[PDB]
């Protein structure tokens, strides 16, 4: 679908309504598969960190590390398609100008590529931006082929604030996700038993960001 249509008939209304929006088959197999390869190349070439220190005790030969990350600008060699994904996310947001709440998005962060190694680690329940640092919208692109949460875990569980239930989103291949970055969406990544990749980009609201250093 053309971005503007995807944005106007789906993204905008879903976001203002639920604060969470899922888009399957965002770029298609050929482009989605290439992004997967570039991401996997960065991993195999050691561009990723060693992983978040989960269990830090006494004999550090058995320290347990979880999610590994690397910041991508999109212009790095061997990251062209990743750069293409970022431009595609930008166009959608751009088309949502002045319709996502009363926000006015003027910029974004670099892409944060994450790899949960599959050693049973996940990510504790958290709020992406709990202290008004400017990030209003979180955007995640998943690239995991035939991911079966029933055996591999790695579900993204979001607990919408004005709700008793929670939303379970599987890190499926070619899936694009949007959700308010603040207190409205506390979320967590359930333990992953298989290598799990995702690419995150946060969009900034001009006003929240502008006063971030003086509020």
């Amino acid at each position: 679908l053309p971005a503007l249509k995807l944005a106007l008939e789906y993204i905008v209304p879903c976001m203002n309504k639920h604060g969470i929006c899922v888009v399957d088959d965002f770029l298609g197999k050929e482009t989605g598969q290439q992004i997967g390869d570039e991401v996997r190349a960065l991993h195999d070439t050691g561009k990723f960190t060693d992983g978040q220190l989960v269990s830090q005790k006494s004999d550090s030969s058995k320290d347990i590390r979880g999610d590994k990350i690397t910041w991508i600008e999109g212009k790095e060699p061997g990251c062209e398609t990743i750069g293409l994904l970022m431009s595609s996310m930008d166009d959608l947001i751009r088309h949502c100008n002045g319709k996502l709440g009363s926000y006015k998005i003027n910029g974004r962060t670099k892409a944060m590529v994450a790899c949960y190694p599959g050693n049973g680690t996940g990510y504790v329940r958290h709020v992406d931006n709990p202290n008004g640092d400017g990030r209003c919208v979180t955007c995640i692109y998943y690239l995991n082929k035939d991911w079966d949460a029933k055996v591999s875990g790695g579900i993204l569980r979001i607990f919408p604030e004005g709700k008793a239930q929670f939303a379970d989103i599987e890190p499926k291949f070619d899936r694009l996700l949007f959700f308010w970055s603040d207190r409205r969406n506390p979320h967590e990544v359930q333990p992953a038993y298989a290598t799990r990749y995702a690419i995150t980009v946060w969009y900034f609201d001009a006003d929240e960001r502008a006063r971030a250093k003086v509020k």
Binding site: I105, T109, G134
Partner: peptide
């Protein structure tokens, strides 16, 4: 803080 890119 986080680096900001103009889209």
């Amino acid at each position: 803080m986080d680096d900001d890119f103009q889209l």
